[PDB]
Design a protein around this ligand. Structure first.
Ligand SMILES: Nc1ncnc2c1ncn2[C@@H]1O[C@H](COP(=O)(O)OP(=O)(O)OP(=O)(O)O)[C@@H](O)[C@H]1O
Ligand SMILES: Nc1nc2c(c(=O)[nH]1)N=C(CNc1ccc(S(=O)(=O)Nc3nccs3)cc1)CN2
Ligand SMILES: Nc1nc2c(c(=O)[nH]1)N=C(CNc1ccc(S(=O)(=O)Nc3nccs3)cc1)CN2
Ligand SMILES: Nc1ncnc2c1ncn2[C@@H]1O[C@H](COP(=O)(O)O)[C@@H](O)[C@H]1O
Ligand SMILES: Nc1nc2c(c(=O)[nH]1)N=C(CO)CN2
Ligand SMILES: [Ca+2]
Ligand SMILES: [Ca+2]
Ligand SMILES: [Mg+2]
Ligand SMILES: [Mg+2]
Lengths: 559, 544
């Protein structure tokens, strides 16, 4: 089977799974795996969310710089469709398997064995990806995958699928040149590494053994490929996923979701979806500029409770100063000030996340290259310049993004009000945007949804989007209601000094609502007022003993 | 004339149903009834809530009637009572004297009721039950007097549900014109068309009332007052009867019988549906603070949205008395308002006035001078129970907030041990309500208050809020505004800063109160609180 090393380039679809148990470093570890996969295997065109997952019963920064170059070559360029991947999804006719393919009944029994053999032989942070690969075979990829593992040194990368193939290779152990040969074909090579690998490649199963048995795997695949149907499976990934969840409720009285949590990432750390309402402080430099003043306003917001600061330099209501001249210097003064540290040598938890509210590629490029920002807040949902998406992946870094719905601009917005179906048009729009970024290899868990309150919505439509916010229960949700006219509209009425108060207080009501609907991030001017509110509500929800209400009631009834 | 007009004075327990279907005058019609019951029939020792109720067929001339009522031959003793033996006898079903009217047995009663029911085959009813310790000899005499009461009011229906433990069914009652006069004269100082009109009205008498078992609005009311009660003719206790009726309505048909039969509380003279609105009570602390500035503050608050104003002259935790602070302020306001020049046509815009006092003398003056509507007693009428006597006038009833505290503002933070915090307080409030109810204060006029920050550590004030659902059946009134415990919640110019956080923390509780359907919140910052409620209300208004 020597044509494994054929230099004739193929295009292949491979679905991977990546797991670590280092919680403190999950983001860092798994985004490092991702970058290496991108570098050494092909193009990432789908990813699941990050999940904290329970088991199924019951120096990187310096090593990143010097890395063997790939023999293949990278285009960060954008794509609309993928013909190969579309074929993988429908199961369509793909070139026959290089390796020998076992049949389904033969495959099932081999996997029966491996599960039971390991059943008897007796926190996870999981992620799936889809690779468009220039690798000819799953085994060659497994050689590379395990070399990726080996250099990273903690990190487990499996191969869940390879095209439509059904494969169970029992006898595997091979030439320490054959390993050198595979790794000569794809990576531009510069000794103890291979030794550890020959031992580990005992066998190969395509699809993976625990594909249909580990919940955490179904959970990841249900994000990426809900409709996929391998010949090996009884049903589509989503149906399996549903049966698993349904069946765990009927037969064990367990909701399996409870111990397996969806994660979104803002900067470098895990955030559990729906578990915290984060405050985002508004700094509109636009509001003859005062960069010293505006940076103290930034610090004012940090001490007031904001986890995230949102900075932009355009007006939503200006003679000759540019957007860049408004935001880059303030951000630079912030980085300068913060960095002349006076408080701690352990300030890895205390730093505010910085978001830039821009649609301009050039602004965001300058920011990213000067390490000035963490999050792109793009109110066009990257529709003004999709190339901006490219600036979200550096060689090692990833950046997170807020995608927001609007129509038109502040001057034309208020008229652009007709929707076929308000709630679902806006939801469908955003999922579409997410599909695009995900196709272009923006990690799904780094993408935040924003419905764009007051942007091309009548005030009753702003209210209605809020009435139906549960529609984002599956998603990181970032909203901005602060000081907008729809809040005022709700009120049954020196006159406009009262109006400003009535508006800030009505905002605080949406803070509460947002707290109960479990919104991930809220974009507010009045950071103190909001944090106060959130603190009280968080306290009222901290129940020391969760079923004491019924106990105490019975204690009273029998006096 | 025989043993019906017998000179021996008796003490009987009677149970009454009160009904009207004028919605706007529901309170005025039914309390007129309550007064007339209290004047002519005996002593009111229990009442149900007020209910807006689905029909089960299956004008200021009334204030002029109160100025011309003939005198009762019997007395109103207003002294407080702790006990009523006849009443405990009624509930236990122990025995009173022989019935003066011929009784029938269970079999025969059931037949004759079912005879009436079968033979008997758009606006809501406003319903109320009462227990009366009565000096009337028998149900027939009592029904006669009831009819006089109904006719005087000219709109109203008063039924006898029980009368002692008697089972009576008298079929073809024929009463002579001079007999009714004689019955009426036995109880009322009579000094003409009324009595000729009554002669027909009484065709028969049934005890218990025919529809007792068969109308939901009846079991609803009785479930408040006498859940344990089991008359011989009944197949189970009031509560079980009520319960079985709720569950049966959910299987037999698919209705939640609760949804359309609503519980009502009364703040002044209007209906409030329990749990349908979170009202704002504006705090006016008058602690020499001059009447003019304060009355302006009252006006600022009404425009800012307050439904109720709560005026207090006492410190919370010199040479000026409580009366001299509060009474003048309330006198100026009564006057200033009566300049209704902006509105010669609107008078329902008037704020309800709450007096935050415990001193009998202060409230007496307020009451004598129609300066207030509600007593806000922070001791729950514990400190001087005589104050309960001032909530009834001949024609008015006043509403009362009953707050829980221990000790005084100095002793307070040390009186913090509770076996079962949530239910100790609740049961304390229930005990206190039972005590006003026994003394003839309408149950639907009593609001509950957990007393946040009064003999409560900060975590206990939080715990009480966390368990506010415990008052889902009750009219609930809370005061969190600018209390120390709000600040306890917060994580970390100093003085005004913490002050801002505390007002905003209070708006968080305003939000929580909204979702928990709290009936009244006592706040300093009215405009701010009204803004929160308005937005939350909007988000909840799913109408297209
Ligand atoms: N316990 C009772 N209370 C009141 N009325 C009674 C009672 N038992 C029998 N009756 C008779 O029933 C008659 C009907 O009462 P009324 O004229 O108020 O009409 P109603 O309200 O339809 O009756 P009900 O309240 O019995 O449904 C009374 O006039 C009275 O003669
Ligand atoms: N992710 C995200 N980013 C934002 C958001 C937002 O909601 N989400 N909002 C603004 C502020 N936009 C805004 C301000 C005021 C109104 S308004 O309706 O109250 N006033 C108007 N301005 C122009 C026409 S109407 C509407 C939108 C700026 N950046
Ligand atoms: N019905 C009703 N009437 C009231 C109420 C109330 O809650 N209900 N509260 C006050 C206000 N009293 C008060 C003010 C502040 C505190 S506190 O929270 O500051 N108490 C303290 N706790 C610890 C140290 S001081 C306590 C009570 C006055 N009248
Ligand atoms: N589909 C597959 N993907 C990845 N590794 C596989 C597969 N089938 C068998 N293996 C082998 O089995 C091992 C599984 O190890 P682990 O994931 O650490 O339990 C790997 O090291 C591989 O050599
Ligand atoms: N809900 C309700 N229904 C009734 C009532 C009443 O008081 N309440 N009274 C009736 C006879 O007057 C007939 N039907
Ligand atoms: Ca690549
Ligand atoms: Ca009396
Ligand atoms: Mg593995
Ligand atoms: Mg009647």
């Amino acid at each position: 089977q020597e044509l494994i090393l054929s230099e004739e380039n193929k295009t292949n679809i491979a679905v991977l799974n990546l797991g670590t148990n280092d919680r403190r470093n999950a983001v860092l570890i798994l985004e490092t795996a991702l970058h290496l996969v991108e570098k050494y295997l092909g193009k990432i065109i789908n990813t699941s969310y990050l999940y904290e997952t329970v088991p199924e019963y019951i120096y990187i920064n310096e090593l990143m710089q010097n890395l063997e170059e790939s023999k293949y070559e990278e285009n960060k360029e954008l794509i609309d469709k993928c013909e190969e991947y579309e074929t993988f999804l429908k199961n369509g006719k793909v070139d026959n398997s290089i390796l020998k393919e076992v049949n389904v009944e033969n495959y099932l029994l081999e996997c029966n064995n491996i599960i039971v053999k390991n059943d008897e032989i007796m926190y996870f942070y999981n992620l799936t990806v889809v690779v468009k690969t220039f690798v000819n075979d799953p085994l060659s990829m497994l050689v590379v995958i395990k070399y990726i593992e080996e250099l990273m040194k903690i990190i487990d990368i499996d191969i869940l699928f390879f095209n439509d193939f059904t494969i169970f290779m029992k006898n595997i152990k091979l030439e320490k040149n054959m390993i050198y040969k595979i790794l000569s074909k794809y990576i531009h090579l510069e000794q103890e590494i291979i030794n550890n690998m020959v031992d580990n490649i005992e066998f190969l199963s395509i699809p993976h053994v625990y594909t249909t048995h580990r919940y955490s795997i179904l959970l990841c695949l249900n994000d990426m490929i809900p409709e996929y149907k391998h010949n090996v499976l009884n049903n589509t990934i989503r149906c399996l996923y549903n049966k698993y969840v349904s069946r765990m409720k009927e037969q064990y009285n367990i909701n399996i979701k409870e111990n397996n949590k969806r994660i979104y990432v803002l900067k470098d750390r895990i955030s559990y979806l729906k578990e915290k309402t984060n405050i985002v402080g508004i700094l509109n430099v636009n509001y003859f500029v005062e960069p010293k003043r505006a940076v103290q306003r930034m610090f004012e917001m940090i001490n007031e409770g904001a986890s995230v600061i949102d900075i932009g330099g355009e007006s939503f209501g200006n003679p000759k100063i540019s957007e860049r001249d408004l935001v880059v210097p303030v951000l630079q003064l912030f980085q300068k000030e913060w960095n002349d540290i006076k408080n701690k040598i352990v300030k890895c938890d205390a730093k505010p996340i910085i978001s830039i509210d821009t649609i301009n590629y050039n602004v965001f490029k300058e920011c990213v290259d000067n390490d000035l920002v963490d999050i792109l807040n793009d109110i066009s949902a990257c529709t003004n310049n999709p190339e901006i998406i490219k600036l979200l992946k550096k060689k090692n870094k990833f950046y997170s993004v807020v995608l927001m719905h609007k129509r038109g601009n502040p001057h034309t917005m208020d008229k652009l009000t007709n929707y076929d179906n308000l709630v679902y048009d806006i939801k469908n729009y955003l999922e579409q945007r997410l599909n695009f970024l995900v196709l272009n290899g923006i990690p799904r868990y780094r993408i935040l949804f924003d419905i764009g309150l007051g942007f091309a919505k009548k005030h009753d439509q702003s209210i209605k989007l809020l009435q139906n916010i549960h529609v984002y229960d599956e998603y990181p949700l970032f909203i901005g209601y602060s000081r907008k006219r729809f809040i005022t509209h709700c009120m049954n009425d020196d006159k406009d000094q009262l109006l400003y108060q009535k508006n800030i207080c009505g905002g605080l009501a949406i803070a509460s609502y947002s707290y109960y609907k479990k919104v991930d991030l809220i974009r507010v001017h009045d950071v103190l007022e909001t944090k106060s509110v959130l603190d009280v509500l968080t306290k009222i929800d901290q129940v020391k003993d969760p079923n004491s209400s019924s106990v105490d009631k019975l204690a009273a009834a029998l006096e």
